[PDB]
Design a protein around this ligand. Structure first.
Ligand SMILES: Nc1ncnc2c1ncn2[C@@H]1O[C@H](COP(=O)(O)OP(=O)(O)O)[C@@H](O)[C@H]1O
Ligand SMILES: [Mg+2]
Ligand SMILES: [Zn+2]
Lengths: 280, 12
């Protein structure tokens, strides 16, 4: 379903959504089983929580001691679970006429906590729940408009021995260099040396950990300068697709600070933080 | 003159 097609009819039903993660709150402890201790006889009992309500006892459950209202909650002995709140923004494609994309809040508990990072495309299955909002802190009064959110039950972020036996077969091929150089950029024609140079950058040198000095890194830097119409930008895009991480920065569209890192402040936490530039 | 009840520590 689309984020703009959820109606009241579809409340309390299992739906499937896809979107982009925008922001996630830190871990929130959610109580599961409460712990009570009698102030008089030092008797301890555990009571369950139903619908966010503690089934507190009126008086001590022991027979000899029955002092009413003498039970107290020991905060640090109650069982707890994990809770987290995420904000999901619909994919840019779904936007009908170029407006601000809508967002829907999600809740994930236990294992699914810290499963999706900020700025990732995920597909989430959960229950489309509804819940009241209290008009003010100090009253049971409720607003007539209900808040909508999704109770997530599954999240999907959108080597075998057989493969290893297969991979080891290619390495035996005598013309492996040509095969890989021809497969890295199928479309580009008669640039075998350029392709070979590009390929060796993906593999990279060898890493060395080195005390009594500094680390030595096997990273290769390549410059492709030549006449305009030749396939330079095409190879740039082709390699940009293959690599797992990379930023397609251009000329005059990037800044000195923008490449390295930007100093900023976090509004939510009100602390000085720094972002990661294109190079970082 | 007054009504009082007592809770003993040994009862713990
Ligand atoms: N050897 C080649 N193989 C495939 N396409 C080529 C080749 N030489 C030129 N072209 C074509 O010419 C165009 C060159 O544009 P572009 O790669 O953007 O040049 P540059 O990025 O160097 O300005 C490409 O769109 C590409 O389709
Ligand atoms: Mg170019
Ligand atoms: Zn008691």
């Amino acid at each position: 379903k689309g984020m703009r097609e959820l109606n009241p009819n579809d409340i309390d039903k299992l739906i499937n959504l896809k979107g982009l993660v925008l922001r996630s709150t830190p871990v929130i402890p959610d109580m599961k089983v409460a712990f009570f201790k009698c102030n008089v006889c030092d008797h301890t009992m555990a009571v369950e929580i139903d619908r966010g309500v503690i089934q507190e006892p009126a008086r001590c459950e022991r027979i000899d001691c029955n002092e009413p209202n003498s039970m107290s909650l020991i905060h640090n002995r109650c069982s707890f679970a994990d809770k987290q709140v995420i904000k999901l923004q619909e994919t840019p494609d779904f936007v009908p006429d170029g407006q601000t994309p809508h967002s829907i809040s999600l809740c994930v508990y236990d294992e699914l906590v810290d499963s999706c990072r900020a700025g990732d495309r995920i597909e989430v299955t959960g229950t489309f729940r509804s819940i009241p909002i209290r008009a003010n802190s100090r009253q049971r009064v409720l607003k007539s408009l209900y808040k909508t959110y999704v109770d997530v039950v599954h999240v999907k972020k959108v080597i075998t021995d057989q493969d290893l036996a297969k991979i080891r077969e290619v390495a035996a091929r005598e013309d492996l260099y040509s095969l890989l150089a021809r497969s890295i950029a199928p479309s580009i024609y008669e640039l075998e040396d350029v392709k070979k140079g590009i390929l060796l950058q993906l593999f990279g040198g060898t890493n060395k950990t080195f005390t009594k000095g500094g680390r030595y890194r096997g990273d290769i830097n390549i410059l492709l300068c030549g006449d305009p119409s030749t396939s330079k930008s095409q190879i740039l895009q082709y390699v940009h697709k293959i690599t797992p991480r990379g930023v397609y920065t251009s000329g005059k569209g990037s800044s000195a600070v923008g490449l390295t890192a930007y100093i900023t402040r976090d509004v939510d936490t009100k602390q000085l933080v720094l972002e990661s530039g294109a190079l970082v | 003159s007054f009504k009082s009840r007592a809770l003993n520590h040994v009862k713990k």
